[PDB]
Design a protein around this nucleic acid. Structure first.
Ligand code: CL
Length: 513
RNA sequence: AAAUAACAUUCUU
């Protein structure tokens, strides 16, 4: 027959080319991969009317969109900094495109236009899980039971699809009935048991803290696992680290990665490490235990991982640090120096390391720690981004020992660094830092006097807003940081009746905008 | 059968 022959042929070449790229270890291949996705998705809306659009072709497309989500997340962490929320970014639009593309395919399956296999069903539901749509995963799965096409309905009931579903079902129902029945069948079964069924059942038992059943299934999973498809052992192993409430079992599995004890490769996934650090802090309140695990993670990473990974780790660590030393900047400052010395001994210091430290140090409300971090950027020869200059301006809102001159200086140096790094206009995060250093500080000191029972920063704030308005990303930022900001900080309302007639006296000196 | 993917520091509007 072949009415849609050319579109079917190009779809197979497209999907296979991009799937091979995303499974093998800007650039022409990078551009090909992302253009192959839009083209394949474009062909999908035409080929869904064809009868030769089998479950295999749909499943290969769903897998490809899944790898697109994986690649988009990877690209976000490889950047020198996260893009501003209010500006255009490849990460945001590509994520929405993949997500919307996955919605259209899920709806076409729930209606019956296209068929899907158990392999395609798992990538569809895993994708929606990675998009934080757990409840939608349960609806799609249970709606597959009452489908006309019994073949696709049977695919959603295959063991590997059930394996993905078990952790979501235990989160909702908290029922161990169906899991324990499956445990009795699987432990003594001589038949083929899909590794993803092992994985989901292990994860349930880890959350349920029935660790003996979790470790027993884990041993069977290991002896049966195939070298080419060993990733099931990675998910379960990491689950023991980040999900086990028994910290002694979690740390043993953590050491198995540090000491390279396992027969399979495994990444020290920072999300898993962060959850492990948080569980130690919530359960033990032992900062030394948190500090010892953080030290092992930093030495494990070294220079092998992206700076965005260590940034996420240091975020968790310094958040715990400044909660522990919330009322002790004296012993805290000595401990920070030990942390800086250790971190220097592992690798060259990255900027997010000091950015997180400076951000969280606002609880101390002292100027010495601000000048200490600012000095260390130059001392350790840190590649600078605009994040530091934003935080250095924001930090002035947590101390009283400063003047409108220093607020201007740290604002001017931020605008300079914006144009030095080729930034187009002034983003929301830039104005939010100036607002936090003026309006929030003034509202804070005002609320203290009411609760208790270079003289004005709000005037400088409104002067810079009006002076630098033509450099804004959008003129709607004027309403956002004036009338809209007054709804949250009412002390701005008493300065705003005469904003239209206000004059400005500042010192811009731009370059590239 | 077709595994595995770190959601980072600065951003209420
Ligand atoms: Cl930057």
């Amino acid at each position: 027959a072949s009415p849609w022959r050319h579109e079917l042929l190009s779809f197979d070449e497209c999907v296979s080319s991009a799937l091979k790229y995303s499974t093998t270890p800007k650039n022409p291949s990078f551009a090909m991969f992302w253009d192959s996705m839009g083209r394949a998705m474009e062909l999908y809306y035409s080929l869904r009317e064809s009868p030769d659009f089998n479950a295999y072709r749909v499943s290969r497309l769903i897998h490809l969109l899944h790898n697109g989500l994986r690649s988009t997340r990877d690209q976000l962490v490889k950047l020198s900094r996260k893009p501003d929320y209010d500006s255009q970014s490849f990460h945001k639009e590509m994520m929405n495109f993949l997500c919307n593309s996955l919605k259209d395919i899920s709806d076409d399956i729930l209606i019956g236009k296209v068929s899907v296999s158990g392999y395609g069903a798992t990538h569809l539901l895993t994708s929606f899980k990675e998009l934080s749509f757990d409840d939608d995963c349960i609806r799609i799965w249970e709606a597959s039971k009452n489908l006309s096409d019994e073949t696709t309905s049977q695919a959603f009931q295959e063991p590997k699809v059930v394996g993905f579903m078990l952790p979501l079902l235990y989160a909702k129902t908290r029922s161990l009935t169906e899991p324990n029945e499956l445990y009795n069948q699987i432990i003594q079964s001589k038949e083929f048991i899909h590794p993803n069924l092992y994985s989901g059942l292990i994860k349930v038992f880890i959350k349920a803290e029935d660790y003996e059943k979790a470790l027993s299934l884990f041993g069977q999973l290991c002896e049966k696992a195939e070298v080419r498809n060993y990733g099931y052992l990675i998910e379960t192993h990491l689950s023991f680290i980040g999900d086990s409430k028994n910290l002694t079992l979690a740390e043993s599995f953590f050491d198995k990665i540090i000491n390279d004890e396992m027969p399979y490769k495994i990444i020290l996934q920072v999300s898993t490490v962060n959850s492990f650090l948080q569980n130690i802090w919530k359960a033990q309140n032992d900062f030394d235990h948190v500090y010892r695990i953080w030290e092992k993670a930093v030495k494990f990473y070294g220079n092998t991982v992206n700076p965005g990974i260590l940034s996420s780790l240091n975020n968790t660590f310094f958040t715990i640090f400044f909660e522990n030393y919330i009322n002790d900047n004296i012993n805290g400052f000595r401990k920070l120096q030990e942390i800086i010395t250790f971190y220097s001994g592992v690798k060259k210091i990255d900027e997010p390391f000091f950015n997180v430290m400076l951000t969280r140090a606002s609880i101390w409300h002292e100027r010495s720690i601000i000048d200490f971090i600012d000095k260390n950027y130059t001392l350790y020869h840190i590649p600078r981004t605009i994040i530091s200059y934003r935080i250095l301006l924001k930090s002035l809102g947590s101390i009283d020992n400063t003047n409108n001159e220093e607020i201007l200086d740290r604002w001017l140096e931020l605008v300079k660094k914006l144009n030095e790094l080729g930034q187009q206009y002034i983003a929301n995060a830039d104005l939010s830092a100036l607002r936090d250093a003026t309006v929030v500080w003034s509202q804070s000191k005002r609320d203290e006097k009411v609760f208790s029972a270079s003289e004005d920063r709000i005037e400088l704030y409104l002067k810079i807003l009006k002076r630098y308005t033509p450099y804004f990303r959008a003129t709607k930022q004027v309403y956002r940081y004036t009338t809209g900001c007054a709804e949250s900080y009412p002390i701005l309302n008493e300065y705003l009746s005469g904003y239209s007639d206000l004059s400005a006296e500042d010192i811009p000196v731009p370059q590239l905008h």
